[PDB]
């Protein structure tokens, strides 16, 4: 069987949807952990060196010049577009605020379901290239998975239609909602823009508190992969309740609602729309 390594649980889950029984799949970043900065364990280094295919997000999630995945593949003498593949290739890239330069991308493309489809098609193409005798399975599974994601994307495009503009604001700890905000017409705000920044100074909390006095949503949200303390402080100081945990940089643990890319996005759409409509 093809040996496949994925950098995190979101990419690994998309790969499972395409490949099912046919591959030997290893996922590096544990569920619930930050995928931006991680220290691979010896088993991760071994599996990466022995893999036939390595999938990573790209666009400044784990692949900055000094970032953990770049070091891993360079130490292993692996080559981009031969051994390892950025599943985000082909998306319309959004950058960090005020930026336009390579290396300053916003990585969170998968929160737009159109980009989840792009990721999945890229995964399927590279699995078919390296394991052509399972093409029938990969293509069949891809076609059904894409159809399912497209139906959810159509739902997402009208999910927030009944909510007034003066309370359409998704508030999370990390500024990970740019692609969702652009695709689905719901602006977003944050404590820290990206996880490599300082995660929750009193000044960052104060900046968000001041923003929430201008546009005041009925709910805040907190991601499954961050320390909740900063958002608990935002909630206490603003009086706006945390409505639900949501899934941004990780799927949920197995058996918990949201334990796949599809299920985490359905969860996010339901919980965010329900909380904002209060
Ligand atoms: Zn993130």
How far apart CA 258 and CA 137 sit, in angstroms, is: 25
How much distance in Å is there from the Cα of 75 to the middle of ligand 1?
Answer: 25
DSSP 105: B
CA of 196 to the centre of ligand 1 (A): 9
Residue 158, domain member (yes or no) = no
Give dist(CA 189, CA 176) in Å, integer: 9
Distances in whole angstroms, Cα of residue 75 to Cα of each of 5, 70, 203, 251: 16, 8, 39, 28
Do 12 and 128 have their domain in common? yes
Q: What angle do CA 50, 45, 225 make, to 5 degrees?
A: 125
**Å resolution of this model?**
1.4
Annotated binding residue 36: yes
Q: Are residues 175 and 87 in the same domain?
A: no
Q: Which of 150, 174, 194 is the last residue of a domain?
A: 150
174 assigned binding-site residue: yes
Closest CA to 126 of 86, 76, 90: 86
Residue 57 belongs to what H/E stretch? Answer: none
| DSSP code of residue 22 | G
CA dihedral 66, 82, 77, 47 (to 10 degrees): 90
In-domain check, residue 194: yes
What CATH number does the domain containing 182 carry?
3.40.50.1980
- The token pair at 203 is 């000044």
Q: How much distance in Å is there from the Cα of 249 to the middle of ligand 1?
A: 5
Which of 104, 124, 150 is the last residue in one of the domains? 150
Do 191 and 109 share a structural domain? no
**Cα 173 to ligand 1 centre (Å):** 10
DSSP code for 215: S
- Alpha-carbon torsion (136, 138, 143, 148), positive or negative: positive
Q: How many Cα atoms are found within 13 Å in the side-chain-facing hemisphere of 138?
A: 20
Q: How was this structure determined?
A: X-ray
- 54 lies in the same domain as 174: no
Which 8-state DSSP code applies to residue 130? H
What is the extent of the structural domain holding 218?
Answer: 165-276
Specify if 160 maps to a domain. no
Q: CA torsion angle for 161, 165, 170, 175 (degrees, to 10)? A: 120
What separation in Å is there between the alpha carbon of 129 and the centre of ligand 1? 30
Domain boundary among 150, 177, 201: 150
The answer to whether position 243 is within a domain reads: yes
Domain co-membership, 173 together with 119: no
Ligand 1 midpoint to CA 94 (Å): 14
- The pair phi, psi for residue 30, each rounded to 5°, is -60, 155
Same domain? 8 vs 145: yes
Residue 211 lies in a domain: yes
Same domain assignment for residues 108 and 241: no
User: Does 140 share its domain with 248?
Assistant: no
* Domain assignment present for 19: yes
Q: Examine the domain organization and report whether 197 and 127 are in the same domain.
A: no
Q: What's the CA gap between 42 and 30, in Å, rounded?
A: 14
From the CA of 247, how far away is ligand 1's center (Å)? 10
138 and 18 in one domain? yes
> In this structure, are 20 and 144 located in the same domain?
yes
Assigned domain for 157 exists: no
The conformational region for residue 185 under phi > 0 = left, psi -120 to 50 = alpha, else beta, is left
Please check whether residue 26 is in contact with residue 4, taking contact to mean a CB–CB distance below 8 angstroms.
yes
Number of domains in the chain: 2
How far apart CA 57 and CA 39 sit, in angstroms, is 16
Q: How far apart are CA 120 and CA 11, in angstroms?
A: 9
How far is it, in rounded angstroms, from Cα 138 to Cα 218? Answer: 43
**Dihedral of alpha carbons 172, 69, 52, 254, sign:** negative
Shared domain check, 259 and 188 = yes
Q: Tokens 């995660």 belong to which residue? A: 199
For residue 155, tell me if it sits in a domain: no
Distance 245 CA to ligand 1 centre (A): 15
């Amino acid at each position: 069987k093809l040996k496949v390594v994925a950098t995190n649980s979101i990419i690994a889950d998309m790969t499972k949807a395409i490949a099912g029984d046919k591959i030997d799949l290893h996922s590096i970043v544990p569920i619930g952990q930050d995928p931006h900065e991680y220290e691979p364990l010896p088993e991760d280094v071994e599996k990466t060196s022995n893999a036939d295919v390595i999938f990573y997000n790209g666009i400044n999630l784990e692949d900055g010049g000094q970032a953990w995945f770049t070091k891993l593949v360079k130490n292993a003498q692996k080559t981009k577009n031969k051994d390892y593949f950025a599943v985000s290739d082909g998306i319309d890239v959004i950058y960090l605020e005020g930026a336009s330069e390579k290396g300053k991308e916003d990585p969170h493309a998968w929160l737009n379901l159109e980009n989840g489809i792009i990721y999945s098609k890229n995964i399927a193409k590279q699995l078919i290239a390296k394991d052509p005798k399972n093409k029938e399975t990969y293509e069949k599974n891809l076609k059904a998975y894409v159809a399912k994601l497209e139906k959810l994307d159509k739902e997402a495009k009208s999910k927030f239609d009944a909510i007034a503009e003066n309370k359409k604001l998704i508030v999370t700890s990390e500024g990970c909602f740019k692609y969702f905000s652009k695709a689905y017409g719901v602006p977003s705000a944050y404590i820290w823009e990206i996880n490599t920044e300082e995660e929750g100074t009193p000044d960052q909390i104060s900046s968000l508190i001041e923003k929430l006095k201008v546009i005041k949503p009925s709910a805040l949200f907190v991601e499954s992969s961050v320390d909740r303390r900063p958002m608990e402080t935002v909630s206490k100081d603003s009086g706006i309740p945390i409505y639900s945990e949501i899934f941004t940089d990780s799927i949920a643990k197995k058996g918990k609602p949201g334990d796949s890319y599809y299920a985490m996005m359905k969860w996010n759409l339901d919980k965010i729309s329900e909380g904002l409509a209060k």
